[PDB]
């Protein structure tokens, strides 16, 4: 019973956790024994103690990312420069002029603090910001095309993440969905073909987390705009990457689309996540024509999507950085634009820390990985891994224990050889890497 | 080898639509199908001009006016005028 387990650990662990550890372990042996899968009760003493050790720590923990994927959906997307985290810390520490204008001394709209930055950086007439890009979509449809049709290419009906899908959202959006062209190809005649009285919207979505090769055709963006200005229809581009600037300017050569460029091209509305290529905290970012934004703003779901104090502040600081050309300060930009050189530099500095540890086979390989996970699907870039192999322990079991470390470490596996992509690894992590390994193979 | 076998059948008359046994017309599809049933292992078989029309046939035979469910990822445009949605319509 739970009272005997409270007697076994008196001062050992606080009474509150011990009973929550006996209640979860006791439902686990009640169901394992009912199903007839357990013949021994002896593991009960150690496991109620491991639960207590575990239940006494946070579920969400910082993790050292070895995979060399900058934008790791599973690992928390764009991490944040300390500068920013500090400004977020300060604003959360007490009250703040969130919804308060200091000039007039009367309430004010919280989305007003930021928008000045967006409209300067992109060039759009006005702007706005909601919970994530997801809702930013759901908002631009339900606002603009409730009960009327929207035209989109059959190749752009994406499923990104686990629950999101343009057709399943747009439906619930209340917009009527008109799918032109074919999977692989879509000409301009396909869009123009389906125009009619009901058509309220010309939407294009960017294939963020996939890509098609082979015989493939797509509708030029200059073309969608010409088309809409013909029949008097608004265009709506879901970047999704929400890349904020031209990326070629950093030496990486891709066609990824960005706010500034897409707007000056003549699209009427653009959106994208903030926790992607922008580098910030999670946010739906929407920019374009004044008359449209106003309309979005006034829709009463906007209040159900409006951003929290934490992501609001933190977004301002990241926007600040971007105005100050302080690029290297926003993690997701530095990690992609890191010099091939620089990577090696780090690679061998690590190797140097592990030489001494027993049983460790350590080598430095130059590999081609694909860094972007949720925003740059075709991108392939050279990065140096430190592959390691232990005589006593196998690569699989290695990863596993590394994931259970404090802090935990997550990495790629490849042909029974553990790898460490240096693209995503922070310096202060190296010392913690060495201490982790030596605690595992010497214990 | 092929081209010769073709050349030869083309240089004169042939039992194309003619069954020699019964001395009566026969289906031209009949010559081939025996090979197809053996190689594939299906119950029966048939042949038409090209795959394009083979799709068109199987839809219009089996689904005229009824629903055909297909993956949104599989609606292709192969070649310049063949498109599964465009033909499936017709």
UniProtKB/Swiss-Prot annotation, chain B:
Q: Which residues form a coiled coil?
A: none
Give its localization. Cytoplasm
What protein family does this chain belong to? Belongs to the SelA family.
What does the function comment of this entry state?
Answer: Converts seryl-tRNA(Sec) to selenocysteinyl-tRNA(Sec) required for selenoprotein biosynthesis.
What name appears for this protein in its UniProt entry? L-seryl-tRNA(Sec) selenium transferase
Q: What gene codes for this chain?
A: selA
Shown portion of the whole protein?
92 to 181 of 452
């Amino acid at each position: 019973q739970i009272s005997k387990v409270v007697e076994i650990f008196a001062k050992a662990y606080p009474e509150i956790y011990v009973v929550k550890a006996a209640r979860e372990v006791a439902e686990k042996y009640r169901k394992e024994i009912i199903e007839g899968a357990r013949a021994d009760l002896n593991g009960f003493l150690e496991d109620v103690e491991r639960k207590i050790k575990s239940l006494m720590k946070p579920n969400i923990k910082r993790v050292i990312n070895a995979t060399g994927v900058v934008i790791n959906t599973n690992l928390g997307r764009a991490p944040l420069s300390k500068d920013v985290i500090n400004f977020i810390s300060e604003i959360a520490n007490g009250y703040s002029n969130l919804e308060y204008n200091l000039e007039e001394g009367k309430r004010g709209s919280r989305i007003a603090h930021i928008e000045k930055y967006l409209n300067e950086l992109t060039g759009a007439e006005s702007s706005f910001v909601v919970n994530n890009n997801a809702g930013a979509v759901f908002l631009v449809l339900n606002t603009l095309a409730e009960g009327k049709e929207v035209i989109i290419s059959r190749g752009e009906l994406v499923e990104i993440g686990g629950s999101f899908r343009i057709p399943d959202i747009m439906k619930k959006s209340g917009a009527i969905l008109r799918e032109v062209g074919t999977t692989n190809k879509t000409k301009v005649s396909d869009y123009e073909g389906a125009i009619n009285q009901n058509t309220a919207l010309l939407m294009k979505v960017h294939k963020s987390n996939f890509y098609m090769e082979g015989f493939v055709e797509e509708v030029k963006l200059e073309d969608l705009v010409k088309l809409g200005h013909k029949y008097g229809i608004p265009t709506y581009y879901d970047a999704g990457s929400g890349l904020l600037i031209n990326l070629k300017e950093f030496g990486i050569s891709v066609d990824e689309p960005n706010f500034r460029d897409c707007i000056s091209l003549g699209i009427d509305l653009v959106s994208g996540s903030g926790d992607k290529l922008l580098g910030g905290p999670q946010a739906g970012i929407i920019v374009g024509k004044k008359n449209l934004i106003e309309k979005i703003k006034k829709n009463p779901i906007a209040r159900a999507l409006r951003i929290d104090k934490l992501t609001l502040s933190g977004l301002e600081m990241t926007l600040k950085l971007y105005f100050e050309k302080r690029y290297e300060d926003i993690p997701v930009i530095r990690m992609l634009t890191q010099d091939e050189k620089a990577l090696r530099q780090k690679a061998k500095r690590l190797e140097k820390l592990l030489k001494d540890i027993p049983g460790l086979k350590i080598s430095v390989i130059k590999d081609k990985a694909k860094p972007g996970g949720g925003s740059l699907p075709e991108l392939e870039l050279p990065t140096y891994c430190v592959a390691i192999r232990h005589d006593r322990l196998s690569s699989q079991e290695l990863s596993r224990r590394l994931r259970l470390a404090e802090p935990p470490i997550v990495c790629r596996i490849r042909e029974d050889q553990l790898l460490f992509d240096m693209r995503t690894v922070f310096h202060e992590d190296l010392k913690t890497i060495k201490k982790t390994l030596q605690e595992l193979l010497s214990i």
